[PDB]
Amino acid sequence: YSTFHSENRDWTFNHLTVHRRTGAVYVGAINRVYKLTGNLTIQVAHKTGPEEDNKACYPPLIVQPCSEVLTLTNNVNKLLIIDYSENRLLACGSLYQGVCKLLRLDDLFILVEPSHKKEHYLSSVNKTGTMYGVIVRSEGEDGKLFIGTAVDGKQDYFPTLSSRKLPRDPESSAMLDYELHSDFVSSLIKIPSDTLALVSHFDIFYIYGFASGGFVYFLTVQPETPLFYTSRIVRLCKDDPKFHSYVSLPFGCTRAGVEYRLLQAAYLAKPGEALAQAFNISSDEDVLFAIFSKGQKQYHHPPDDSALCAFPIRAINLQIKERLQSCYHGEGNLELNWLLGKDVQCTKAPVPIDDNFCGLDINQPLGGSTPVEGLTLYTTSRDRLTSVASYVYNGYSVVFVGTKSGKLKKIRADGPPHGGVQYEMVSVFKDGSPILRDMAFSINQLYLYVMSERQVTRVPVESCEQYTTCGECLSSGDPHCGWCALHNMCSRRDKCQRAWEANRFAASISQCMSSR
Amino acid sequence: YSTFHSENRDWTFNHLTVHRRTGAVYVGAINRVYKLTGNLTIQVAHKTGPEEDNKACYPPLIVQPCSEVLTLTNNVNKLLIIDYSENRLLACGSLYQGVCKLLRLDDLFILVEPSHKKEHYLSSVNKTGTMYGVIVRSEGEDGKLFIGTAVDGKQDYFPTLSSRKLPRDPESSAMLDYELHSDFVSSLIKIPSDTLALVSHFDIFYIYGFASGGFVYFLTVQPETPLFYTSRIVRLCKDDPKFHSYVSLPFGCTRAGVEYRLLQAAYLAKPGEALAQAFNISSDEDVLFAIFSKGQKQYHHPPDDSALCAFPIRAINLQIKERLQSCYHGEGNLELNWLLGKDVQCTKAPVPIDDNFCGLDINQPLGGSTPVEGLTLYTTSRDRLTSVASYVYNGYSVVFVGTKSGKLKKIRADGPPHGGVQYEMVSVFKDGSPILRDMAFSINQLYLYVMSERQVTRVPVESCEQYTTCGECLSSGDPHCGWCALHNMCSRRDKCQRAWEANRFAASISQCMSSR
């Protein structure tokens, strides 16, 4: 398999995205952002470090001279998003309190590196898996960036969640400015200092985020408030600069007496037929696939026991609506201690709560303590699940799941009884290193780009050729595979010469015979 | 004695100031600010509350509807300062997050009450003894207010110390705005969240403040940082909107093996001759008089053991200069743990440190751990000292010291050996009510206005008539008293008929015989 090695064993890989039109592979790494061809040949290597820094220097070196002692510091890639409408890449690092660069897609030339305003500094956190962003731009206009990050106990320096202006012009003076910033109403959420005094390790880790319909969603993990942890879905309306639409519910999944409530990884996709039926949704609707490890404790040293589950966005929005309706009836409390700092009674008010409700000055920010439960598809306790991607093939949701021992599981989402069935597991990383969260399909869906800390590998979505009889091929459980009869070969339909002619491609067990 | 009683029983007096030209007496009270005559007849009673409020309402009712449950709430007066150049009074209360009013001196007509910006809310604290201000205005020009306050753990909402615009025009849109407010430099100090996580009862009480020379001074009490308390002098340059001149040193005094380091009260005045000789300063120079309780612990329930001591401003500034020169030579550390949050080494730089030094971006904010030691003048262990005022009469410093049992001590400062000698104690409040900090002279210096929580009383500075022979009178130790020979009466010079004529007023013991 095509593979790209880190140039240094120390400068590990962080993030990966694939341009959905050109097919170029962009990789964010320590001290580097790379542009690779589809087969993982380097085209551009853009250097982001190392550099002289100290994270006690606020503001950074470019603005003021600093007082504390500097050390050569690696630049951890924290964020890597293609800004599609504008043919550029947003790359945010850990250096200098977490400044971002905008880079031209073609050659990674620096368009702008805003480093003079307080909001130009996203976060001084130097851990990955702590920040996530979503660009909302109606194609061809000025845009907005929702950015969620851990703040490292630096509550006043960095909001944990905010929206920023992402104008068309890279040199606009409004670049990364808050959408709204005023004395009492701003497009940002700060961690309150009282929560940090109560829970000293307190911080919020943003594992994933996506847009779906009129809303953006962030998936978070954080210490629980009076070591237990809570995984949550956080939702905002796309048009809500006041942030009155903030709602946060816990989420997780369970199966056969086990609870999985520590979020590891997630991926938004469309469901195949049987999964759509199990949810009573159409196959056109969005479904969130998520990996959770067992229980609610020791987040930083998780057990191998883990699960893949699935949440339709419709069901998420429904549970949020019923929460809003209840609260607006005066029932219960807001239930978001970490942000509200105390019990806050829900206030009864005559307000229509429909699907598109985006909050008012009361009853917000809204939480809850009843979790959104997912449909568990697959579980294991031998090899911890670490990443997920999914797509539809031959009417089946196919879910690819990375493990901590560098394997890739292929799971067919069949529905009851099992929910999902693993039909194959492949060794990707010889060294047995964990697969990292970011996996993305090539434009033609023929491959999934998968990565470890030291390698990016282009893994074919199928290797049907391994099956050497019609019977084995069609009994494999792999939705990609059928029997190319005249060429004595198991393959995808489109890899079978003259597949359209009668008896040339057997797509079922019984067709093995009729083909013969 | 002329007395003014409070109109309710629970609506206690908080603050007092005498207009230095007109002799009008202004009293800050719970739910009232009064203007009284020199003999304590009400002229104006200005209603400041009670009003429905909740101190969890931020921003307060007056600018937003609040979902919180409100109680009818008393308005504690927390600040009362005459703005001399502008014929107005600044009156800050506890209601609505600590909004302030400017009232016309004549009739207490409301000139302005700022409450649309976040800086218009000084602090939701509702206890007295926590806030102090200093107006710095070149006469007939736009000016500035320095404001220190306790914040009750709401460090996100209110800075502990800041400088504000005080424009001549009461209707300026910039009224009480920060003098400087920008991303990385502002005319304010915030209490770090880390310090509150470390010490959860942490807060800073501003007991007194004054201008002298190029500088403003604030006298503070706060818990120590790793229950011990530190009393400090905090100094700023009058022209330093960047607050780079901030220097904070502990202060206190000692006598005969006892340490007194819990600040209770202060008053700035000129020294008489014995005191000025003792400091080796001019009688034209400022001296700070201070009351300290014994030790460094249990600030809220202090020992009766207390001291009066004096600090020449010249010596305070010298010790600060020495501190600044040492630090700019690279010796030691900044030593201000509550604000800096950690150990910070002093940075050597080739910078002249003269008397007028106002700091640069390095080596600030500056602290220190060696106390400024005052000259102890008087100690007691029998009845706690609560207030202080001083002036010069017949070339002597006379210090008036209030007590917790409603008494007023009169202390003559003679220097070595005793430092000071009490020559009279007077029972002001028969019921034993503690004397409050704010004591002020009438403009003819004939009286000291003294208050308890329930009364304001106009106390003659002498009652020489009590001594009924020449010998007793001139041995009284009371600097006010001489013998009016013809009228056989001990009195002040200006109460002795034809005192200007030879032999009519015996001002020494040998003059008893010749006047007879």
Ligand SMILES: *[C@@H]1O[C@H](CO)[C@@H](O)[C@H](O)[C@H]1NC(C)=O
């Ligand atoms: C990968 O693809 C490029 C074309 O983009 C091709 O020229 C190159 O030879 C390929 N690399 C390998 C190892 O086959």
